[PDB]
């Protein structure tokens, strides 16, 4: 239907809107400004479609949808519609998050299911899934993320190296920081951070151009602690966004693709807006 959509995301080129329903359909529309005319509907899940994500065009516009069933159903526009080219279901139930990764880490998908797993789905020539699974949390993983420590993605003055940090949101009430070492094939648990005594809903990574990285750990205590990294290997410090508890029942928490402004997607269908002011402090903006 259109009587309950759980996520919507837009491709880079601005051609297909991909709304995901909870009766098991991914209704795919046409971006024509603000007008939208339908072009597909894909039923294939056995659980409510939780989330959908787009992939950077340099490795195709790939549409990864996940339900509560232990299935991630990858589609890709082929056959004059949207047709699978991969599938990944190494979990059993409650796949929550599914986020694509930049090509400075290669073409990987970063899957979070609530069964205390996270897979790192590497993609090869034939479009093959290669889940390199890891146990994290123990009550559930809601979400997943990573970047350099010593250097960065290869360029001019960012070296190259081989490492990838993570943020994993859990339903154990923690938000763990895992660290990949591509020089050892080790996933080393590094830091465990706890800001909430209620489930960490969403986690996210700041795409800020700043060396500091901020992580917005939202919760059902209606509190967001901002986990402040001084650099790319510095400590983490709990900080308050709103100094009081939001009226917004917080689920998601996304930073802008230009700016460092944070929107918290309230159950009231209002987005409160908190960004740092001329004093150095998270204060209102909407």
């Amino acid at each position: 239907h259109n009587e309950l959509i759980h996520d919507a995301v837009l491709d880079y080129y601005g051609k297909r809107l991909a709304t995901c329903s909870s009766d098991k359909t991914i209704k795919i529309f046409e971006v024509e400004g603000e007008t939208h005319k339908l072009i597909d509907t894909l039923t294939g899940h056995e659980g409510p479609v939780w989330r959908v994500d787009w992939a950077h065009p340099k490795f195709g516009t790939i549409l990864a949808s996940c339900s509560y069933d232990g299935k991630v159903l990858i589609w890709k526009e082929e056959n004059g519609r949207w047709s699978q080219i991969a599938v990944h279901a190494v979990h059993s139930a409650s796949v929550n998050s599914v986020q694509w990764a930049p090509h400075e880490y290669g073409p990987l998908l970063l899957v979070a299911s609530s069964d205390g797993k996270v897979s790192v789905v590497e993609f090869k020539e034939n479009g093959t899934t290669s889940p390199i699974i890891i146990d994290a949390h123990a009550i559930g993983v809601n979400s997943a993320s990573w970047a350099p420590a010593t250097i960065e993605e290869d360029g001019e003055h960012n070296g190259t190296k081989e490492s990838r940090k993570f943020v994993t949101g859990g339903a154990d009430n923690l938000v763990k920081i895992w660290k990949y070492n591509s020089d050892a094939q080790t996933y080393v648990l590094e830091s465990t951070l706890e800001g909430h005594s209620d489930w960490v809903r969403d986690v996210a990574w700041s795409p800020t151009v700043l060396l500091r990285s901020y992580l917005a750990s939202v919760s059902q205590d209606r509190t967001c602690i901002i986990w402040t990294q001084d650099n790319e290997q510095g400590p983490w410090k709990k900080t308050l966004l709103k100094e009081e508890k939001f009226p917004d029942v917080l689920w998601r928490a996304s930073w802008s693709l230009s700016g460092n402004v944070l929107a918290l997607s309230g159950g009231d269908n209002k987005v409160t807006l908190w960004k740092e002011n001329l004093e150095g402090k998270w204060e209102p903006a909407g």
């Binding site: 056959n79 004059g80 519609r81 047709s83």
Partner: protein, 148 residues
């Protein structure tokens, strides 16, 4: 068959054209050739020379320009027996598209024929056929069969 220093291709082109326009000779002659084509198709061989193949091809292609399913039925039979089997799938495939004289049930029947002939192949290049420069897969034909 045994010309090529006792028959020239052009004189032969004219004969082949003549008996197929005259009703009295066309049927008996052309069924006869195709029975004999069947006896060498069973072998995995030809019965005919390269030149004769193209002459017949050319006349029938000009009979497509007069319409009717039957013209394609001749071109089809010829191609299957004289080993142009990917092109034979093409012949059945042209018919569904060119004609809007066919009904919706009729489009479907035709689609069903092309689809099973493509997938019976022992070759992985004969699993699809060409419409212009775009490759048409079984998957595409299948979408077409439900939509037509």
């Amino acid at each position: 068959r045994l010309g090529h220093e006792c028959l020239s291709d052009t004189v032969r082109t004219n004969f082949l054209q003549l008996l197929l326009q005259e009703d009295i000779y066309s049927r008996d002659f052309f069924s006869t050739l195709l029975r004999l084509c069947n006896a060498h198709s069973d072998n995995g061989e030809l019965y005919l020379r390269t030149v004769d193949i193209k002459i017949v091809d050319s006349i029938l292609s000009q009979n497509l320009r007069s319409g009717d399913w039957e013209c394609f039925k001749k071109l089809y039979c010829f191609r299957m027996l004289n080993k142009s089997e990917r092109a034979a799938a093409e012949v059945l495939y042209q018919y569904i598209l060119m004609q809007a004289d066919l009904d919706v049930i009729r489009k479907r029947k035709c689609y069903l024929m092309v689809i099973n002939v493509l997938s019976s192949f022992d070759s992985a290049y004969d699993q699809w056929i060409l419409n212009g420069s775009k490759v048409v897969t079984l998957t595409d034909l299948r979408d077409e069969l439900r939509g037509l």
